[PDB]
Amino acid sequence: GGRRFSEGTSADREIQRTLMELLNQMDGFDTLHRVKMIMATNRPDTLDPAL
Amino acid sequence: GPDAASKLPLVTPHTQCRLKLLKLERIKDYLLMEEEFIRNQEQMKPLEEKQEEERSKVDDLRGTPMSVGTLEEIIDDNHAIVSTSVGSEHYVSILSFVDKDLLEPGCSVLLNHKVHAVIGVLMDDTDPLVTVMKVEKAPQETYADIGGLDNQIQEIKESVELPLTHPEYYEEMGIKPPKGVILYGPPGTGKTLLAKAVANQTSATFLRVVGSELIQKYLGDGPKLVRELFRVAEEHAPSIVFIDEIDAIGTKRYDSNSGGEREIQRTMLELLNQLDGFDSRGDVKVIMATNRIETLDPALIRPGRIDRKIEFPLPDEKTKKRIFQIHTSRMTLADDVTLDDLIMAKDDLSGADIKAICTEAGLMALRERRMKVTNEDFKKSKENVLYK
Amino acid sequence: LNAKVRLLREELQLLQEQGSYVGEVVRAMDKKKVLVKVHPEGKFVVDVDKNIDINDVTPNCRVALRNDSYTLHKILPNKVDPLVSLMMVEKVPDSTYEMIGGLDKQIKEIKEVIELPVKHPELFEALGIAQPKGVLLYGPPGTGKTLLARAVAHHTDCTFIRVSGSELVQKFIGEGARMVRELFVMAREHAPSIIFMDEIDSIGSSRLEGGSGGDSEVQRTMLELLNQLDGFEATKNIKVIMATNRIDILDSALLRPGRIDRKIEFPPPNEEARLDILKIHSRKMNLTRGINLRKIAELMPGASGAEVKGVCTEAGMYALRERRVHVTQEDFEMAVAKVMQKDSEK
Amino acid sequence: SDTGLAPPALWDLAADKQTLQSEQPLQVARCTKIINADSEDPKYIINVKQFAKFVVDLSDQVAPTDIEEGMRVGVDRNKYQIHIPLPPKIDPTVTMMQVEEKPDVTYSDVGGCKEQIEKLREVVETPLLHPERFVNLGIEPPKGVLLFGPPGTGKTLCARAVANRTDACFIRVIGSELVQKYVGEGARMVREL
Amino acid sequence: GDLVGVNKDSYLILETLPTEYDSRVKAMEVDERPTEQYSDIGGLDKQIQELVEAIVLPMNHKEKFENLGIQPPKGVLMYGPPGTGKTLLARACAAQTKATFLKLAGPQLVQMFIGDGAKLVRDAFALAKEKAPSIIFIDELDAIGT
Amino acid sequence: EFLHAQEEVKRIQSIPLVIGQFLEAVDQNTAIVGSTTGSNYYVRILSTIDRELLKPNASVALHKHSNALVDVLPPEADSSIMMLTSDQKPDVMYADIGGMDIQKQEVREAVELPLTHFELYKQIGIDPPRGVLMYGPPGCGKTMLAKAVAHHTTAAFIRVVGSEFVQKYLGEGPRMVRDVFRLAKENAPAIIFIDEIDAIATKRFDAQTGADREVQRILLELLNQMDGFDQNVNVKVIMATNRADTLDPALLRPGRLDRKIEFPLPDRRQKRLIFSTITSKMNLSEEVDLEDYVARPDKISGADINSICQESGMLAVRENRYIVLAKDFEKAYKTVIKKDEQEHEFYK
Ligand SMILES: Nc1ncnc2c1ncn2[C@@H]1O[C@H](COP(=O)(O)OP(=O)(O)OP(=O)(O)O)[C@@H](O)[C@H]1O
Ligand SMILES: Nc1ncnc2c1ncn2[C@@H]1O[C@H](COP(=O)(O)OP(=O)(O)OP(=O)(O)O)[C@@H](O)[C@H]1O
Ligand SMILES: Nc1ncnc2c1ncn2[C@@H]1O[C@H](COP(=O)(O)OP(=O)(O)OP(=O)(O)O)[C@@H](O)[C@H]1O
Ligand SMILES: Nc1ncnc2c1ncn2[C@@H]1O[C@H](COP(=O)(O)OP(=O)(O)O)[C@@H](O)[C@H]1O
């Protein structure tokens, strides 16, 4: 997940892309039908305000 | 390594003393015997030509598509591990045709393209860092041009120039020359002027780096440039390294700095080692210039790292007139402006302001296509520079 | 006809010899041998076919290798110059003195430090004044700082290299990319050049108070650059510039006299300036007869260069919502309402 | 020329025939790293640099005890057979820290640190030299010393001097070299050391 | 997901190789057991017992916990001032126990590449499970537990 | 026999061929091509290939053993397929958008209108925008408008995701980005959507990892291909992001997408228009008053508005009811907006 740093690190923009893919396949151009997701976290504040 | 010229610079006679003649004739006799010594043996033993046969066989042993790779380690002589072009490591066999001396761990190696082995070393392209700070020659500023500062020119002459022109003085009293010089004064006093003056009448590779480039973007690429700076200086024989605006390694904060102050400090702790560490030093003299000598760690200035501290004050009235004369020397004035009247324009003019007046005066004469500056030009020049 | 049949019959036997690699020759070597770097593959030292003279084999360029006994075959078309790539990523629009509005006094003051010292040396030495190196252009955003800087870099036949960080393009200038004084390594190779350095990193509305921030990596650039063009620099044909919205926030070093030779002024256009600015950008649409532009200028008190070139373009758009083919007076008048009147707040 | 032209007299000393005698009989190998020693008798699992992870056994002359897991070893370029163990890889930046030339300063250019010098020799210049003295007693000599003081007091001189007489290998570290860009490899230089 | 060997020229499965573990993870398994009896540690008597009854006893008397139906405790954190005997107990407990003693560290699970740290943690626990009763010691947990 | 040599040279075509790419022609009978294996080869072109197809970077088939042009394939692509109605159309009308006229109009005047009334722009004199950025808060209705445009569009639509352009095979990303623009040119009226462009265009680029050197080429290829439009091919590009602050400035310059369409948090007016369009399809009851709900000072953009209606109706199914009463919405707002304690009234 994460908060999508500005001025992050070299091997941290890559994890950002993976979030932007898990992010887009949730609610994007092709609505996902009959697939429900459950997520858990002990710190639901570092999450990007898009997830 | 070896020098092609200077076979025997024995100019001690410095005259028509016969001693010059005896040595010269000695080689002539040796040359005569060598002539028939080589050709004679070159007939009944036509195995190696040494001029066309020697080169020819090695080329066949070499390959037409000679490869380029990085030597990664030195296993026992005649054997080494060389990194292939892309990502592979090969336990190649070193051929004796190579000098076997330039095989530094990581420079370059030429390998055969089929049975890969060491065929020859390759000289390393001049890294862009060296060219960045390799000042060739100070364009125009001479040493009598500086003017004004007199007691302060002797210190720099006596620390970074005398030990290279007359070493005897620090050769008979057994005193090592003062290590470094730090120049400090108000903004604009000739600090850099004297800095580039020494580059003029010097015989050593001058390197210049401003304090602002010592602070970089990524962590660790800090006190690694400092290592590169002093690695280039050592590699280039005698050299004077000039660090300008040293008060930018903790006086100015930049967002590009991934690590904050804590990272900049480690740059200083590496610069501290490079000036006085338990490594050998060689011949490298550091000139540091700053406009705030009170804002830097008082260990970089500790005696031993930088020894002579030279203080640059605002120009004296008598020196102020000299500054105007030197800057206005090549100017066709209109025998109507008096230098002495403009000497007292503001309580303290740095001297860089003096050149600013004498340079904006010309721009104020170009606008009218006039090749003579009048009092009006200077009067409006003295107001457009040190007022707004 | 007999030859044509023969040629086409040998093509089948000809279009089977292995193709040729395409590489770049970093530096020529001795004994008619060159050192080339091949496409996605390692470097190679390769012999040269006798048909090609070693003199033609020059620094970076595109060559060919046979298939397995690599040997230069032909000097292929030249590769794109690395600097031109920088001018393609950054897209400072090309501009000329004609599309300059209201700035006549400033145009005169810019040609005296970037045009005269370049196109006419031996005139600045007739007074003994050292050539000016660096001009600071200030003024509100959109007033025309970049539009004039390019013009003076277009009418003097000098390359216009813009340095603004943008580490995306931080590979066409220097592979190492350690210190800013590497652009010079390419600046001195491209004849007289002007190193523009823009500003305005969303400043004036953010970072007003303290906390993080600090300095500006568009200001530290000259302090490095100007420190070299003032002494330790051989080629005296390189000159630098800034555009900044504020001259009171410049460091205490860039304002010391002797560093910046001239400080040009770019104020928001006055009435006689807005009309001329509007005229230039209005000669691009099918304007109707008798469009009173003097009335349009009055209606926009305060518009640097973009609130004006936002009334001409939006005027055309307003002529499209109606499905018309001619731009009328109402369209321009209704344009100022949106760009200026409706957008005045915040 | 300008590439590798060595003393021409040494080339014939190279015995070009032997070079040809060595540029054919001597097969060039490829570096690799062993991951497993699959049991049965041989069947060693191998991992070449960037080709694949093959399965190799031996050639004839490498004793099984000569090879162990995680050991650098060369392999054939055609059938991929282990032929010679290879040394472990030490980071070149960490291998340059070893001092090869002793600094030209001895334990007679530091003055006033009589007590400091004596206390710095029973932990770095006596446990190694004359190591039998402590054996005839139960003593593990102290291992480690911190030298602290105001700048320009002699912390480095007493260290540069110890390297002039020490018989054991001396390894440099500056404290800023151990700062590196990426997370991780700032401890590798402290593990490899 | 299994590892299988394949013919080099005509790809075809010939054998099923044993599961592979990162070379780093295999070097953290102690083979030369340290020699430090419990009598070597002093003062920490109420704490040495508390550890032997949570990491060693539940490994030799499984018949006892299952008789009372209490799941054995998971994990033993050891904290205190700089030097008090934390690593002595761990080293000592690695001597009076006939079981694998996978010895982790602090800075070591940290690796530059993305996901390389996870490998050394998943592989450091799969290996212990792949073997008989094992104790995995994670010293200097600050570096990976901030 | 000439007709016989012509029909005999075709043997060099054969079935097994490697698709390459055309880069530049050096002279007649020769050219420079780039093989998909990853390389640049100096090959010889067949004397029967119609040179009219030897366009700028395109699809050319090379002989397997010895690279040599032997054909010119029709334009194609790999990971970019035009949406062919069917079940792959967005299925969202413009009437389902909760009153974003000002934003809706802007996209219409910059994407849809130029494709239809191309000749009008030349007549008036305006230069049509060549790409619109869609930036704003997270959930203000950016993708939904694009979902609508793909529906009521008479031109082909090409959908991509920003993270799709970076793949394991080195050197494949630049080819994938190039195929999208090439395929969007064959069907001249088309719209190219690059969603979540934040993953392909970021200022920071550390040129040592190799994951950034592969993203330096994707972004550079995008820039190069967006400067190859000659004001005569109508291929509009729509690019939607969430954090515009991270975008490389070079991507927001004239010639590239220069039309910043802000999508801000709805104001009081718009908020009332969103509750009405969403609640139109719901059952709803007379006693429910929407005005009471769109009156608060809270800032709920577009999703918690749908979440409110979503959960509000969700409550109805709890007691098995097919109407939503005012008692249902009240219980929905307090579990969706969850206003923070931000206040500290002693400050005012
Ligand atoms: N005492 C002086 N004598 C001669 N020229 C001077 C003197 N002081 C300043 N100048 C002139 O000032 C000009 C611009 O400032 P200068 O380069 O001298 O600054 P500086 O004293 O080195 O200061 P800083 O460290 O702030 O850059 C120089 O070209 C130099 O000729
Ligand atoms: N006791 C001493 N006798 C002789 N010279 C001394 C003594 N102490 C210091 N010096 C001088 O100090 C210089 C080197 O100082 P050194 O770097 O060792 O000091 P330091 O305080 O340990 O350094 P730092 O804190 O900068 O790392 C030498 O020129 C040496 O002659
Ligand atoms: N005005 C509106 N009318 C109807 N639904 C709306 C409105 N505004 C937002 N929504 C709702 O917002 C949801 C998400 O919108 P959309 O798919 O366009 O994403 P987005 O806001 O652009 O997301 P992101 O910015 O994170 O990419 C949709 O399910 C839609 O129902
Ligand atoms: N005096 C002027 N005459 C015509 N156009 C102008 C003028 N000043 C600014 N512009 C317009 O502004 C644009 C560039 O503005 P720029 O120089 O970047 O503004 P700023 O200097 O505030 O950054 C050009 O497209 C140009 O059309």
Ligand SMILES: Nc1ncnc2c1ncn2[C@@H]1O[C@H](COP(=O)(O)OP(=O)(O)O)[C@@H](O)[C@H]1O
């Ligand atoms: N109770 C004790 N009895 C004997 N030695 C001890 C005792 N406590 C600590 N030590 C000494 O401390 C050292 C181990 O330090 P340790 O406690 O492992 O450090 P840390 O707590 O940082 O891991 C051993 O050399 C040991 O001799």
Ligand SMILES: [Mg+2]
């Ligand atoms: Mg998303």
Ligand SMILES: [Mg+2]
């Ligand atoms: Mg200075």
Ligand SMILES: [Mg+2]
């Ligand atoms: Mg020291």
